[PDB]
Design an enzyme around this catalytic site. Sequence first.
Site, mmCIF file in Angstrom:
data_model
loop_
_atom_site.group_PDB
_atom_site.id
_atom_site.type_symbol
_atom_site.label_atom_id
_atom_site.label_comp_id
_atom_site.label_asym_id
_atom_site.label_seq_id
_atom_site.Cartn_x
_atom_site.Cartn_y
_atom_site.Cartn_z
ATOM 1 C CB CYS A 96 -61.759 -5.729 -23.969
ATOM 2 S SG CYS A 96 -62.524 -5.153 -22.437
ATOM 3 C CG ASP A 99 -65.336 -2.935 -22.555
ATOM 4 O OD1 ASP A 99 -65.186 -2.745 -21.327
ATOM 5 O OD2 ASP A 99 -64.661 -2.342 -23.417
ATOM 6 C CB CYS A 159 -59.172 -2.528 -24.398
ATOM 7 S SG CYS A 159 -60.327 -1.505 -23.483
HETATM 8 HG HG LIG Z 1 -61.987 -2.844 -22.517
#
Ligand SMILES: [Hg+2]
Length: 209
Positions: A96, A99, A159
Amino acid sequence: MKLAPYILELLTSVNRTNGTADLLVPLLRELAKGRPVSRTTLAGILDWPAERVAAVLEQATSTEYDKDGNIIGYGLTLRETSYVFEIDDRRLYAWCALDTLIFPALIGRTARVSSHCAATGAPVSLTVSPSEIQAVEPAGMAVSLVLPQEAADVRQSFCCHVHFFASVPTAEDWASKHQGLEGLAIVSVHEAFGLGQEFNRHLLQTMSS
Ligand SMILES: [Hg+2]
């Protein structure tokens, strides 16, 4: 906006019993080399018995494996996603938007990040270092947040709802149609990077170094 709830629920997902807290940084650094990571390699790095490495990974239900049972993906992955995470000369991927803003400070590397707007499909890019974001294209780039759900597949619960967008108003338009997502918020990418920084410093305080 208030981001403490997001910071709080993010770190309780990793600080859970047999959570990835202590395993996370070394696993991310190994995955960053662009090759599958074995449990014996992780064991050697952590100085853990095989039992403990397996027990931690068992609870991380989203972990991606190969034909040999070696680790291919945990947040950072070798399987293609819509978030491109280029560190050194290697083309890696993330699960994602958030991240990609979080990983660089943990790896201790600067990454070239790229994606597309989830509302329109327009290309987006930025450079994420351990302490700063730069070359933000477009400038008004935004990020979607949801509150992480505790005992739910992180990929499907968090995510897949955490995207980059061309702009704040564009993301706001998108979010108005998705009001069934818990704690859905639109922030600028700079606000999202700060969220990751707060996560990271809180994470490092609990890592038993
Ligand atoms: Hg994520």
